Amino acid sequence: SQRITIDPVTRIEGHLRIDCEIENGVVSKAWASGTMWRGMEEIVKNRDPRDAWMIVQRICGVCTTTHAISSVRAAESALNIDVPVNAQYIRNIILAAHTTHDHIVHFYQLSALDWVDITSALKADPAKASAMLNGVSTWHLNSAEEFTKVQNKIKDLVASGQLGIFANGCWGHPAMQLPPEVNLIAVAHYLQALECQRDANRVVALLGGKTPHIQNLAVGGVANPINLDGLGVLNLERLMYIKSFIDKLSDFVEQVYKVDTAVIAAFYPEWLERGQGAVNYLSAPEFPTDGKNGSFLFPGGYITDADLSTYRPITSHSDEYLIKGIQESAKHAWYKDEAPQAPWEGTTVPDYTGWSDDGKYSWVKAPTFYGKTVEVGPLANMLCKLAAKRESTHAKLNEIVAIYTKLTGKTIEVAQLHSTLGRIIGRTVHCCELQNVLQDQYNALIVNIGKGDHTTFVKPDIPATGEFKGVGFLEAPRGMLSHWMVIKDGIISNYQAVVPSTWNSGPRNFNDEVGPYERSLVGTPIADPNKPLEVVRTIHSFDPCMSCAVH
């Protein structure tokens, strides 16, 4: 009956509009709309395949690195290049350290102020706030004195009358359920998170040459010159510098981020029972460790009917089962060709007609896997790893659940993971497991260089005539990414990116099935239709990236 629009959705990457029909104060129907297009797929066409990665990296600066690595993986697949293992170690360290930064910033800078009321934090007792975390976390910056310094910075901000980024938030909104003490804790951790995410990006910068937008890749491996005895190249002093930053990440991730995930769950238990986006989930395996583009540290696969018994593992980026299921449809998007397209045959011809509830309403295409709507991202990667009986993922999830049980007396079953909070828990579990990936891959690099292997690059042989088709898969922070490259007569004849936020934010598909964002909103209670905080909470759980979704 009542129709609302949230335009812009803030604390995401890029330009998103969400419309909702409300009946009986519950969302009955939703639309997700990507409102900005660049045509990155057309900009990259007719170039040398080697050039693509520097151009398509600029699809997104929040998930910097991801399109760069997927692009070189697509060119490598098209030319049958086996990537030197040292290049795999370096790509993997960059992706894991980038993803650490990404997840920390998502939980704190992008998501926390959905759950956390900064006006309530001013009313808190710093001593009581500190007392609450006794025996809960061993973090060294949870003192009453730390929380007092934080509370004073918020007091000074509010007193100035210039609240800036904090102006006109959902302060005093009925869906805000943290007590004053936990609000102050969350704000202290918000500011501490910014130090942790800076250390993560120092790892990326020392191998990438900067971030955002790394500049050390190549079709054929990496541009880092390994030489322990060389001045001005990647020597042992540079590697010790990288390791110094790797070593600074684990304490915050384990003693703050992991603990806050459980604390937020403890005060918002009904968010374990709403915000399901799909019954099908996809993830690609990630972090290859051999010289044949395989032996992934993290498994991938496909889950159906929200039932982990159906798990179909994917252990190769060359799996024809994964490659042949993927199509996209523009039936409800602003492009000319509406029938499902395999990406090697995809087109991206703009056809803006304006908004229509029943017609076209987004720049985001609608992907499908063998005709089905699928959620991608940390919940998908978590469910795949649990279905694979990965001990490390079970142990990490159980650590978060044990904190929740200690706070609530209650437990969390696999069924409750199909939820807004389950999606957030998946991301925290991912960030935690990535800290062992950084240690493992750093050590493997040190060991390999010690055996005399300094190989980082194989020159690609690009035939001047003939057609070659390649696909690069990558498990990005927001889920499975795929770059699809057709080379004809030495140049790119077609380039299609199917990006995780494309899967999740996609509009109604060729068989009029809603995408994950649109499904997740059905049944969302709305306390105030002019401030639909409950909608933004579920949407933020997917970590939307609309420059990624649309490109």
Binding site: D7, R50, R58, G164, L194, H213, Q215, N216, P350
Partner: protein, 268 residues
């Protein structure tokens, strides 16, 4: 005392220019927003959304009329009357012209805003342009790079705040402290260039000795910036050439996103 107001509008942006702020150390993004400026509008960081964040912008445009710094990242798409970037049901170009009317100073951050950047490369599907082209009657301070070192932006804003005027600008309205010199005219591999000591393939003997990357397609010779001196992330020794990849000319209109990575600087 009151903090100087900043209004930040993203057009066809990848959000890399905002993300640059999260790497900054002088100031850190938390000192920037709590101590040095009042960031009155920023869609990536704002607690408010939808109708409340549009209220924040119109309240800031009125309260701080004539006092705010207007920052734009991303290109502005002119094709088909602006429909390739729509915020709150209006073309972004309209948001930008409205905000630019009351601005004390206007900054295009990043190559996209400064000259159209990657979004305006190849066939330019959306007719993307730079901010100066949208605002032809205004002096736009350009801070190019994809993204620039965040301090190129922060020290520009600090100059305006501390000394009440913009820093010295070159002919393209770029601050001279960051863009006054070719990368190649202040590059520590110049001695290798001079001696003909060239890497010819990644992983080869010259490359593994830190020789000049001219023959891998370094654009340093035609790119203005401070990549070789200020470098990136304030850890010491981090820029693309130091880690062993040629400059792509991301700062420079007609070089980055136009020439091939391995296209040499003297080839058109």
């Amino acid at each position: 005392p009151q903090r100087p107001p900043v209004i930040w509008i993203g057009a066809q942006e990848c959000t890399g220019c905002t993300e640059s702020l999260l790497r900054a150390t002088h100031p850190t993004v938390e000192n920037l927003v709590l101590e040095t400026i009042s960031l009155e509008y920023h869609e990536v960081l704002s607690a408010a959304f939808g109708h409340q964040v549009e209220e924040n912008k119109h309240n800031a445009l009125e309260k701080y009329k004539g006092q705010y710094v207007l920052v734009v990242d991303g290109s502005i798409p002119l094709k088909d009357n602006g429909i390739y970037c729509m915020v709150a049901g209006e073309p972004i170009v309209d948001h930008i012209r409205r905000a630019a009317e009351g601005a004390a100073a206007i900054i295009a951050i990043g190559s996209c805003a400064a000259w159209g950047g990657v979004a305006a490369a190849g066939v330019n599907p959306t007719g993307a342009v730079g901010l100066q082209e949208v605002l032809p009657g205004k002096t736009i301070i350009n801070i190019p790079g994809c993204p620039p070192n965040p301090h190129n932006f922060l020290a520009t804003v600090a100059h305006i705040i501390t000394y009440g005027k913009p820093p010295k600008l070159d002919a393209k309205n770029r601050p001279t402290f960051a863009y006054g010199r070719l990368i190649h005219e202040h590059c520590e591999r110049r001695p290798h260039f001079d001696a003909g000591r060239f890497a010819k393939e990644f992983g080869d003997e010259g490359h593994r000795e830190g020789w000049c990357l001219y023959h891998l397609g370094c654009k340093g010779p035609e790119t203005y910036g401070n990549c070789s001196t200020l470098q990136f992330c304030d850890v010491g020794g981090v820029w693309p050439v130091a880690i062993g990849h040629p400059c792509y000319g991301c700062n420079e209109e007609g070089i980055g996103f136009h020439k091939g990575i391995h296209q040499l600087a003297h080839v058109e």
